[PDB]
Amino acid sequence: SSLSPTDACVHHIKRRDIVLKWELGEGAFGKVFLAECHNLLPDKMLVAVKALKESESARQDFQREAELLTMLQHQHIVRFFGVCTEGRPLLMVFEYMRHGDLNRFLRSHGPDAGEDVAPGPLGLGQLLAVASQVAAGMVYLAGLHFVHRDLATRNCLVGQGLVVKIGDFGMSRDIYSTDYYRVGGRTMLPIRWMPPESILYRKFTTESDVWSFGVVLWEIFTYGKQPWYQLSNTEAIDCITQGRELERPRACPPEVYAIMRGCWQREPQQRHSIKDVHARLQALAQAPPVYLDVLG
Ligand SMILES: Cc1ncc(NC(=O)NCc2ccccc2C(F)(F)F)c(-c2ccccc2)n1
């Protein structure tokens, strides 16, 4: 549902092939469970199961989302296995990502906090690895002409081997409620990640995702701090619209902060493409230690 363009295709899983283990999360739209899934890939494997709470308007929303998610298969997008529509509750089956959402992972590996990561805070090399993978997922979505309306580290997942993919199970507005500004009745906007053209003109395009990615880049180098944490929602809105930019994080080298600033050009057309932002981050991520050691 977070995607916006700028039933036979859907894979089905028998309810007996899904064995719920325990709850992983809960939101306003449903629950997430860890489950054992049989004969999904050639004997048994762990999966995250999103259960839809309750309804005919929601059943068609579920069907369209499943169709969209089926089309969306890539190396840096959380894997969607299919649905279970034989009875209630309707289920969506996704791969299980061991380390949870990227915001939680960053926070637990920051100075304020070991199979996949070294002790202490994440090094420059791993922060750039994380950033490059998120950018790679955005390059793919932009390439399919899809806009992600809620790009943030809370909406990315981390798996075994520090593999980072875009995806979430729809509970961010519940788990990370302070990351949203409540408006017109029930609507909640991720204002701190939104560019000036979204706040002012209610426009959200591929260039608006480059801006949101720059905020994601800032979250990474601050180990998951909330952008504009010192400010209330209206003060954050004033900053974004008046052109005040987030400051260079302590752990962020000037070369990386240059990439962030390039994402935050006021005019959408002046922002670099996500393809270029990715290219610059991957070049830094795979750069020899000798080079990276003289950056920061
Ligand atoms: C109410 C509500 N708000 C937000 C949601 N989150 C999204 O749409 N996230 C996008 C997403 C999710 C899973 C995998 C991949 C992606 C994407 F598009 F980035 F490639 C969902 C959601 C509805 C279906 C499946 C799960 C999440 N539901």
Task: Please give, one letter per residue, the 3-state secondary structure of 148-210.
Answer: ECCCCHHHEEEECCCEEEECCCCCHHHHCHHHCEECCCCCEECHHHCCHHHHHHCCCCHHHHH
Number of alpha carbons in the 13 Å side-chain half-sphere of residue 151 = 35
52 and 106 belong to one structural domain? no
- Measured in Å, residue 293 CA sits from the centre of ligand 1 at 38
Which residues fall within 8 angstroms of residue 133, CB to CB, at 6 or more apart? 76, 163, 164, 165
> Residue 104: what residue type?
R
- Active-site residue, from 150, 168, 179, 209: 150
- Same domain for 261 and 137, yes or no, is yes
Q: Which residues line ligand 1 (CB under 6 A)?
A: 1-3, 29, 50, 65, 69, 72, 77-78, 80, 92, 148, 166-170
Rounded Cα gap, residues 56 and 8, in angstroms: 19
Give the tokens for residue 140: 């793919």
296 within domain boundaries: no
How big is the chain, counted in residues? 296
Q: Write the single-letter amino acid at 249.
A: P
Residue 218 lies inside a defined structural domain of this protein: yes
Q: Is 61 part of a structural domain of the chain? A: yes
Q: Is 213 labelled a binding residue?
A: no
3-state helix, strand, coil in the chain (%, to 5): 40, 20, 40
The answer to whether residues 74 and 115 belong to one domain is: no
Domain count of the chain?
A: 2
Nearest C-alpha neighbor of 144 from the set 66, 68, 63: 68
Residue with tokens 């840096």: 76
Q: Could you tell me if 153 and 206 lie in one domain?
A: yes
Separation between Cα atoms, residue 128 and residue 134, nearest integer Å = 10
Distance CA 258, CA 15 (A): 50
Q: What residue numbers bound the domain in which 260 lies?
A: 97-284
Determination method here?
A: X-ray
Strands (E), the chain: 3-5, 18-26, 30-38, 44-52, 80-84, 91-95, 146-148, 156-159, 163-166, 181-182, 188-189
**Resolution to one decimal, Å:** 2.1
